[PDB]
Design an enzyme around this catalytic site. Structure first.
Site, mmCIF file in Angstrom:
data_model
loop_
_atom_site.group_PDB
_atom_site.id
_atom_site.type_symbol
_atom_site.label_atom_id
_atom_site.label_comp_id
_atom_site.label_asym_id
_atom_site.label_seq_id
_atom_site.Cartn_x
_atom_site.Cartn_y
_atom_site.Cartn_z
ATOM 1 N N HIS A 1 0.811 -1.212 0.000
ATOM 2 C CA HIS A 1 0.000 0.000 0.000
ATOM 3 C C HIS A 1 0.861 1.287 0.000
ATOM 4 O O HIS A 1 0.335 2.394 -0.145
ATOM 5 C CB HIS A 1 -1.049 -0.009 1.114
ATOM 6 C CG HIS A 1 -0.513 0.343 2.461
ATOM 7 N ND1 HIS A 1 -0.301 -0.596 3.445
ATOM 8 C CD2 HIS A 1 -0.198 1.544 3.008
ATOM 9 C CE1 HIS A 1 0.153 0.006 4.533
ATOM 10 N NE2 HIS A 1 0.211 1.303 4.297
ATOM 11 N N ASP B 1 -0.173 -7.590 1.433
ATOM 12 C CA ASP B 1 0.339 -6.218 1.530
ATOM 13 C C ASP B 1 1.878 -6.302 1.634
ATOM 14 O O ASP B 1 2.479 -6.181 2.713
ATOM 15 C CB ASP B 1 -0.274 -5.472 2.739
ATOM 16 C CG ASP B 1 -0.081 -3.942 2.658
ATOM 17 O OD1 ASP B 1 0.396 -3.420 1.599
ATOM 18 O OD2 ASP B 1 -0.443 -3.257 3.643
ATOM 19 N N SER C 1 3.965 1.751 8.463
ATOM 20 C CA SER C 1 3.678 0.746 7.430
ATOM 21 C C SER C 1 4.924 0.410 6.647
ATOM 22 O O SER C 1 5.726 1.306 6.348
ATOM 23 C CB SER C 1 2.619 1.270 6.462
ATOM 24 O OG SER C 1 1.451 1.630 7.148
ATOM 25 N N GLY C 2 5.111 -0.879 6.341
ATOM 26 C CA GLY C 2 6.261 -1.317 5.585
ATOM 27 C C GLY C 2 7.437 -1.718 6.437
ATOM 28 O O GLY C 2 8.336 -2.388 5.960
#
Ligand code: NA
Ligand code: NA
Ligand code: NA
Ligand code: NA
Lengths: 58, 223
Positions: free
Chosen positions: B45, B89, B179-180
């Site tokens: 994302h 994801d 995120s990530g």
């Protein structure tokens, strides 16, 4: 770019969502990877996922 | 990172700060981790038109000599990534050239299905609270891997695909901007920060790296 407009208010439930109000306008950054679309709000400048059925082309 | 502590500078030398551009409007930011000299792993994302990776950072607001800034030349988003649920994801980023190995910049190359119950650690530059700015400095927090039932309220959550991370009785959690980033368990990357509740209440949902190892191996061998 074609703008999209919110047909309803939406409150984020996941941090990857955008919240928004009816009438808010968006640029769509990724509408090709599922039925939630990555959008950038022209009101706030924030980016996130919105449910595709909550917007229509301006 | 909510409820964490500032990392010892450069103690997590694989950490990547990603700036993701789209034409005209403001860019977005994520974490990532260097798994090979020219590959960063992160969440799907976090994709966008172009990505700049900053390695070697501690305070991301102040340039210093440890920094290595590399352009992404190819994004490999998982081909089954679905935006409605955020299943799959995960994305590999190929860098324009290899990073230099220094004290501040290093890889976390991969060496089993990780069960609930263990303690793991996650780091990032995300918000330190629901209404807080992104953190200037790299933060880290220790979080419990929960039974998948602890994530029941995310109806689409899938134990085979995702980890359920963070004791709901605590405030400790990854959040927006993290995120990530990697979840490390006993020094091995086992998860990738994916999403959580808008109100930051744990647990949050991480991609289970083990499930994607063959796909990761495939992209690495061919690139
Ligand atoms: Na956002
Ligand atoms: Na769906
Ligand atoms: Na180099
Ligand atoms: Na489920």
């Amino acid at each position: 770019v074609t703008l999209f407009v919110a047909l309803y208010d939406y409150n984020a439930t996941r941090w990857t969502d955008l919240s928004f109000h009816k009438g808010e306008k968006f640029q769509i950054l990724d509408g090709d990877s599922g039925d939630w679309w990555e959008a950038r709000s022209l009101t706030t400048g924030e980016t996130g996922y919105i449910p595709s059925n909550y917007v229509a082309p301006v | 990172i909510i409820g964490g502590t500032e990392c010892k500078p450069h103690s997590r030398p694989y950490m990547a700060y990603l700036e993701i551009v789209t034409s005209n409007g403001p860019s977005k930011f994520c974490g990532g981790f260097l798994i090979r000299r020219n590959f960063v792993l992160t969440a799907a994302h976090c994709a966008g038109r172009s990505i700049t990776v900053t390695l070697g950072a501690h305070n991301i607001t102040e340039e210093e000599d440890t920094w290595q800034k590399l352009e992404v030349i190819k994004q490999f988003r998982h081909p089954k990534y679905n935006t409605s649920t955020l299943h799959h994801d995960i994305m590999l980023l190929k860098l324009k050239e290899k990073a230099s190995l220094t004290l501040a910049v290093g890889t976390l190359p991969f060496p089993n299905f990780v069960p609930p119950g263990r303690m793991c650690r996650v780091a990032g530059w995300g918000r330190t609270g629901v209404l807080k700015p992104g953190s200037d400095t790299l933060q880290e927090v220790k979080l419990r891997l929960m039974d998948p039932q602890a994530c029941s309220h995310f109806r689409d959550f899938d134990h085979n695909l995702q980890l359920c991370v963070g004791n709901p009785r605590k405030t400790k959690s990854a959040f927006k901007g993290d995120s990530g980033g990697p979840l490390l368990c006993a020094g091995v990357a086992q998860g990738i920060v994916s999403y959580g509740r808008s109100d930051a209440k744990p647990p949050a949902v991480f991609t289970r790296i083990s499930h994607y190892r063959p796909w990761i191996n495939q992209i690495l061998q061919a690139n």
